[PDB]
Amino acid sequence: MEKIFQNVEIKPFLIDFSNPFIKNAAKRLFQLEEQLPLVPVNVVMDFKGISRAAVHGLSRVLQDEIPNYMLDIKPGGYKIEDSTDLFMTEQFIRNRINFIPIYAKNETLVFALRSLNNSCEVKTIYSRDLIQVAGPKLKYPIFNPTFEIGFLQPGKSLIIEDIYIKKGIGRKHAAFNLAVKTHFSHLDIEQYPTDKKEYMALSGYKQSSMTSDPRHHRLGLCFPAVPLPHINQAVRTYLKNACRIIIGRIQSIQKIYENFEEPQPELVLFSLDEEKTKAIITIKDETHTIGNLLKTCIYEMIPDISFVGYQCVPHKQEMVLTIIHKASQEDLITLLEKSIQNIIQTFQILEKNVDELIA
Amino acid sequence: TASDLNRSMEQSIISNLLNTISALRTVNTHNTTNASKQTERADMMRRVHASYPGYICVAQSADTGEK
Amino acid sequence: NNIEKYNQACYKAAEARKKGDKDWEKHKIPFIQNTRFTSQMAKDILAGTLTLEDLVAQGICEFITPEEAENCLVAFSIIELRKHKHDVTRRFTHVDVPQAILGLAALVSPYANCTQPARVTYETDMNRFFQFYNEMPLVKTIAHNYVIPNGLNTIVAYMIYGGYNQEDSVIVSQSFIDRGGFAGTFYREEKVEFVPVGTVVKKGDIIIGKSVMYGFDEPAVVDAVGLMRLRYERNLNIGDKMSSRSGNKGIAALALPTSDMPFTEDGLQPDLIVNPHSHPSRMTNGQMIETTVGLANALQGVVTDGTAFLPINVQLLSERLAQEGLRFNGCQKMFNGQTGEYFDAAIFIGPTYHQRLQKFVLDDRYAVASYGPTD
Amino acid sequence: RPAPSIMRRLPRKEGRIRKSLLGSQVWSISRSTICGNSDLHLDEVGYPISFARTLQVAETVQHYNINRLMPYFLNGKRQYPGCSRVYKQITQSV
Amino acid sequence: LENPKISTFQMNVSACAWYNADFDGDQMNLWVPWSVMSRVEAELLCSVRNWFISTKSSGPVNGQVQDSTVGSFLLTRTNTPMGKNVMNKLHAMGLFQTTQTDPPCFANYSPTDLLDGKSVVSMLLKQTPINYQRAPTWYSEVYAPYMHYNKQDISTQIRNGELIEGVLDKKAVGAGSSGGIYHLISRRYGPQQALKMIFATQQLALNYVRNAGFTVSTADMLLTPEAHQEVQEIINKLLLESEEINNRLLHGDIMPPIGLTTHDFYEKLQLNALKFPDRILKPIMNSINPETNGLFQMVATGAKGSNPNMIHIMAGIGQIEINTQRIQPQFSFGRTLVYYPRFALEAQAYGFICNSYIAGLTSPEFIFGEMNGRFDLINKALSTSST
Amino acid sequence: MLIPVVCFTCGFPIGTYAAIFDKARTEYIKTKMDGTLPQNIPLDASLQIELKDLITALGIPMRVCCRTHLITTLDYRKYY
Amino acid sequence: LPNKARLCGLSYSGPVNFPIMRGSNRCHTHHLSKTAKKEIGEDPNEPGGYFIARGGEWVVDLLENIRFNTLHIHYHTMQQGNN
Ligand SMILES: [Mg+2]
Numbered sequence A: 001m002e003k004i005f006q007n008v009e010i011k012p013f014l015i016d017f018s019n020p021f022i023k024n025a026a027k028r029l030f031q032l033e034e035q036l037p038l039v040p041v042n043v044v045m046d047f048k049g050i051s052r053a054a055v056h057g058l059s060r061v062l063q064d065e066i067p068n069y070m071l072d073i074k075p076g077g078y079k080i081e082d083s084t085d086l087f088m089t090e091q092f093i094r095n096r097i098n099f100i101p102i103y104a105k106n107e108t109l110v111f112a113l114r115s116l117n118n119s120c121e122v123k124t125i126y127s128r129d130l131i132q133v134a135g136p137k138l139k140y141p142i143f144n145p146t147f148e149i150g151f152l153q154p155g156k157s158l159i160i161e162d163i164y165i166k167k168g169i170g171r172k173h174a175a176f177n178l179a180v181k182t183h184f185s186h187l188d189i190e191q192y193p194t195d196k197k198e199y200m201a202l203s204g205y206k207q208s209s210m211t212s213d214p215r216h217h218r219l220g221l222c223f224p225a226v227p228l229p230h231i232n233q234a235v236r237t238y239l240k241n242a243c244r245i246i247i248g249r250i251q252s253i254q255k256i257y258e259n260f261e262e263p264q265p266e267l268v269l270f271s272l273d274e275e276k277t278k279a280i281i282t283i284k285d286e287t288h289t290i291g292n293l294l295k296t297c298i299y300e301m302i303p304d305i306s307f308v309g310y311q312c313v314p315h316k317q318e319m320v321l322t323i324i325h326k327a328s329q330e331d332l333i334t335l336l337e338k339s340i341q342n343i344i345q346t347f348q349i350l351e352k353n354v355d356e357l358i359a
Numbered sequence B: 001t002a003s004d005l006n007r008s009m010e011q012s013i014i015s016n017l018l019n020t021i022s023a024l025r026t027v028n029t030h031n032t033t034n035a036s037k038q039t040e041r042a043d044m045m046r047r048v049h050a051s052y053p054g055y056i057c058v059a060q061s062a063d064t065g066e067k
Numbered sequence C: 001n002n003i004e005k006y007n008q009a010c011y012k013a014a015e016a017r018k019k020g021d022k023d024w025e026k027h028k029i030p031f032i033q034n035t036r037f038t039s040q041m042a043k044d045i046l047a048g049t050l051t052l053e054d055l056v057a058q059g060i061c062e063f064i065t066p067e068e069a070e071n072c073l074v075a076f077s078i079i080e081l082r083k084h085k086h087d088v089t090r091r092f093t094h095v096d097v098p099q100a101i102l103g104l105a106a107l108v109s110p111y112a113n114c115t116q117p118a119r120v121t122y123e124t125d126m127n128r129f130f131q132f133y134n135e136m137p138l139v140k141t142i143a144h145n146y147v148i149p150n151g152l153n154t155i156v157a158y159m160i161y162g163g164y165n166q167e168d169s170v171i172v173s174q175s176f177i178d179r180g181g182f183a184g185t186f187y188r189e190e191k192v193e194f195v196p197v198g199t200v201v202k203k204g205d206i207i208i209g210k211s212v213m214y215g216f217d218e219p220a221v222v223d224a225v226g227l228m229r230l231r232y233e234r235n236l237n238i239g240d241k242m243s244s245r246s247g248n249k250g251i252a253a254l255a256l257p258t259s260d261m262p263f264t265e266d267g268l269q270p271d272l273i274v275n276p277h278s279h280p281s282r283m284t285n286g287q288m289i290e291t292t293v294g295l296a297n298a299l300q301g302v303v304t305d306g307t308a309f310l311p312i313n314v315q316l317l318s319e320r321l322a323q324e325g326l327r328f329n330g331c332q333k334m335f336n337g338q339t340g341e342y343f344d345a346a347i348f349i350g351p352t353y354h355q356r357l358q359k360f361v362l363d364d365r366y367a368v369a370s371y372g373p374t375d
Numbered sequence D: 001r002p003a004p005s006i007m008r009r010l011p012r013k014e015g016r017i018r019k020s021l022l023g024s025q026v027w028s029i030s031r032s033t034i035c036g037n038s039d040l041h042l043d044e045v046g047y048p049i050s051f052a053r054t055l056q057v058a059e060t061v062q063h064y065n066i067n068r069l070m071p072y073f074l075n076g077k078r079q080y081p082g083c084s085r086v087y088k089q090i091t092q093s094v
Numbered sequence E: 001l002e003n004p005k006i007s008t009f010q011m012n013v014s015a016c017a018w019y020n021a022d023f024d025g026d027q028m029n030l031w032v033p034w035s036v037m038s039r040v041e042a043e044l045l046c047s048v049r050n051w052f053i054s055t056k057s058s059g060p061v062n063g064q065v066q067d068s069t070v071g072s073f074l075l076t077r078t079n080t081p082m083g084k085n086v087m088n089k090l091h092a093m094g095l096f097q098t099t100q101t102d103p104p105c106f107a108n109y110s111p112t113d114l115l116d117g118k119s120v121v122s123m124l125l126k127q128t129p130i131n132y133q134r135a136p137t138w139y140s141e142v143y144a145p146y147m148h149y150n151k152q153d154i155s156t157q158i159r160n161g162e163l164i165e166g167v168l169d170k171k172a173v174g175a176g177s178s179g180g181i182y183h184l185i186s187r188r189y190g191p192q193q194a195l196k197m198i199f200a201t202q203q204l205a206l207n208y209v210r211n212a213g214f215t216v217s218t219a220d221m222l223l224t225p226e227a228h229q230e231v232q233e234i235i236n237k238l239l240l241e242s243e244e245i246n247n248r249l250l251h252g253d254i255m256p257p258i259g260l261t262t263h264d265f266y267e268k269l270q271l272n273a274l275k276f277p278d279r280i281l282k283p284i285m286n287s288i289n290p291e292t293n294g295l296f297q298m299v300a301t302g303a304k305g306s307n308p309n310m311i312h313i314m315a316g317i318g319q320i321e322i323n324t325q326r327i328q329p330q331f332s333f334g335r336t337l338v339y340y341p342r343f344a345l346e347a348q349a350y351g352f353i354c355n356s357y358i359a360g361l362t363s364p365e366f367i368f369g370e371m372n373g374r375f376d377l378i379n380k381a382l383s384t385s386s387t
Numbered sequence F: 001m002l003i004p005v006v007c008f009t010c011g012f013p014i015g016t017y018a019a020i021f022d023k024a025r026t027e028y029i030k031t032k033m034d035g036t037l038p039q040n041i042p043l044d045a046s047l048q049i050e051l052k053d054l055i056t057a058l059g060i061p062m063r064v065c066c067r068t069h070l071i072t073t074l075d076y077r078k079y080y
Numbered sequence G: 001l002p003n004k005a006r007l008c009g010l011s012y013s014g015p016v017n018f019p020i021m022r023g024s025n026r027c028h029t030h031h032l033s034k035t036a037k038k039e040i041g042e043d044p045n046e047p048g049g050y051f052i053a054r055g056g057e058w059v060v061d062l063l064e065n066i067r068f069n070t071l072h073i074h075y076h077t078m079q080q081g082n083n
């Protein structure tokens, strides 16, 4: 009833083989006459009755801050030999291999790249040249075989022996980025025609950003690699996982909140003015996703709040959330605990809505 | 054949592609700097002269070379 | 020109004036000055059939030294020569291509005549940087037919974003740096005066060369053993200096994750965020024109020519943008990547060639602590 | 050119008086490029961690100091904030 | 800065005034006092708070610059293109969330209440009540004929710390603005409070611009075809006046006054003839929209640029003057450049540029402009060396 | 030295289609310039051929940055 | 070969019956081709024109000088004394 996530649309990016030149090149370079094993997927999703903060936080999580997988060379994997090519330095190849999008289920996979050039011409080594030395045999490819790893000058070679699957979040390193933004708009707000030249220098929305409170949004994200046979299932997992990440972070903040009345390094709440009660929460390594989301819920739960705000200073690598309200310390925590529960219910509702639509 | 000359000659010598081209196409007026007299109105010559157009590039160096 | 014919007919017309012909004007003929350069010959030069030596071989061209220049009256461009085609008051000895008054270093900058380098004020493999990725500018000049371009077309947004780009600073995106933007290897070998090749050469270590001490403070790696080559994996670092082709040197002052960068309603986000306050005084209008042209070029998938002194009409370029599907002024609707709110104003964002200057922050930083060598 | 003189050392910008007595090379000093930071107050400067580790501040241990200085001593050179040297009062050695 | 990647000293932009610095590769020296006496001396005597008021001039040294000035104007602006300059409670609170100050109380405002920028600026300024009244840099008699000025913006009045009306501008928050709000704050509460207020106001301005985005486009320097026609007409009128003087010289009707030779009198007369009529601003202002033109707002707020800059960008460069004189013939006996006859009467031959930077100069115009620039650079270098 | 594996600006995997795109672009330019068909057509003329539809056929969306990096990037194999 | 001189730190000076500028007709690289220059160890795109000595590359810049056989009538006097 009243699904927050109302409409979805999955549209993979496909190669149009009707074009003669693309078809001729693909059939010649890679003997390819059909869609690749993995394809980008553009998912356009419409949300209703949810704050902009929550939708944008989900978008941020999907872009990065969601655990993802990448191919990395273990130290000493790059074998320096006499025949090793000078141009194909370890840094260059490491970057190329790192930023190959992969869709791996098992982390215990190791690949190796043993390429030797004996022809007089320059040989190009493609991602198909990667072979699975260790780990369970792959029933389906985890990356497309068309990437250009590099090229070897005649008589040279390149050997890499330990290419394992690393895990991380895109925020710390770009190689772990998961989603590419493609669209974001508020269907709630009307728009001027921006071709008129009287509104050409404006955003196009008829409401100022400083007063508008959109509640109906359309969000579009593109996922680099997804198995073609199972596009729908992959989108379910990605969308579901982000909700889990947000819920976990909010629940950690909730743990800190409930643990008040006991010394907590993060929570620092002290009564000022004998009626107001400040409450400063410092979380290391937290981002705008939770700070912005936490500010919105409290504001919605406490319309008459004296003040609420946050500051994720880039050079402090921490998130500080400040709350001031006219109430006792105990009453303030209960309101904040209730506000946190509202997000968790919202995202729990959001998670189930995914199973209803994407199927 | 005398080899002692090479030392003095290389001492005298010591005395991306845009950089390489600019360095070689550069025309250093070192004799004039020696006559600058501790930069006593020496800059007056860095000005663009009416004879330059077509022969000496009229656009400023833009710190690409010496200060 | 045909002045000898012009003069001869001039005498005949005057004589008819003394006579009773009254048709003296019929004898007068219009003056004509025109170069022998032909559109066909221009095509041949690009095809390579016709060379300058052949041009000089015929009476089309000749070399003029600064001495002989004093005997020459030159039309600054073919436009001027045509404008005064029939004018006998001003007879030209030669006509020149206006691009000839610039060198390659200056010709690199596109739409240079639309900027004044005057306000651009600048007065007062060892150590060589190899950059992996280089791309041709979207708006290329003639200079790029003789030099390999260095730098990258970086989507740059001209906006105020948190105040970290003030005073010629720049806000780079951390993801752009990670992906390999402006990334390369810095090479430095001991040369005259071992250790295994590929060994981490930490500060205060012993590297026997044919020079054991190593105090650069930045970890290195033994590239080779003219020997003992050290290589540094140098990325783009906060404090590194980038500059557009039209001067505009700037220092990378902040790096942000892809989630914090601003994005357009179409998902486009910038690599660099240049402060709009750099333009007004410095007047690098060529940078703006390059951005405007590059938007359309990228959308159409073409690379156009922006050589200086070529005819330019900014109105027509903006109309081209409007035709392509964007706004007439080239601005888009942008959202704050941190809060997800849209800016009340459209933001001018588009590609703009950038390169990194070879002055690295890690090279000139230094700190010492209360002890060391003394005189 | 080969004229080493006692009196030639005094004059000129590179002479004794102008280079050594008036002006001096000093220890415990750092140099680096500057950048903007909107989150720093007017009277604050952002200092890199490595430089904060290279440069030191000398504190004399005392009864009021000991508790605050103990964490620095324990951290040593392993974790910031830490320390680099200690000067014993009894032994007159660092 | 505990992030291992950062390897540069970082300071607030407003601090660059003390050191005369710019983030263009400039380096600076830093040393930490390690002796108790030196630390006490540094903290009590050499704190930058003391250098807020210049010893040389006794006026302020620090203030808002560039984005901070523009953002102050935008925040205090009475009307925006969307409508009245108002914000809801959420965004009013969000303005103060990085000022590093005790946030003001919003308990009396409903989520639907609308607050104007003057209101939030006043909320911030109640910490240091000052009285201030002055006309902003926004209001200029140069622009009044060709644009509409809101009554609430033409006059700035801060009464007991409350911004009653007007727009904060370079005249009020700019660096080195004698009698500015920071000057009075320092004079009444101390230099330390002035720096804190500068930081807080800068944060307010930047936070506002965070939503009311600001940009400069190429289309901001484009003249309407009618304005282009007006500019061409003005240039043609100037050229006609120059040609009339040229005819006077041809007939010998030039009679120099006592003390000036015919050549000097002719040069002065031509120089006076070739000057923009000050009506050249009309076509520029007609084409641009003051409310949404980034370049014009930057120039008018005093954040960066000047009126001659806009005139050169849009209308035309005009006459090049070196040492208050035209391009003296130096290529040859009578010539000024290889592109002109020996004794040329046209103004184009002596350093008159009829084009505009946006329109694109021709080769000789470009050469003259570079002559002027090299002259300026040479003068600066020689001045410093002599000083 | 090669078209980047992913767009520097988005991270979109333009490197999947880089080799196919290069071959197809070479063939497309050759087909258009067959009117003359020398060994090497002038670069200035060659780069004026529109590649919007060719890129669209591959699947890359209409993203300014992705197409910019796809068409502009220099290939170290050609220059050598 | 020029790279051997660079790589080994040896001067490229020629026998004196004198450093040889690379790309000169006196150097071995004269009339060489891009494929060969790569094989020898040189960058094919380098135009030469610089001396190899002391292990580091050195390039001599063009120097301008007053014209010869020309009477340069300098009106400049002597600042020390108006003699
Ligand atoms: Mg500077």
Ligand SMILES: [Zn+2]
Residues within 6 Å of the ligand: F007, F008, F009, F010, F011, F012, F063, F064, F065, F066, F067
């Ligand atoms: Zn992209």
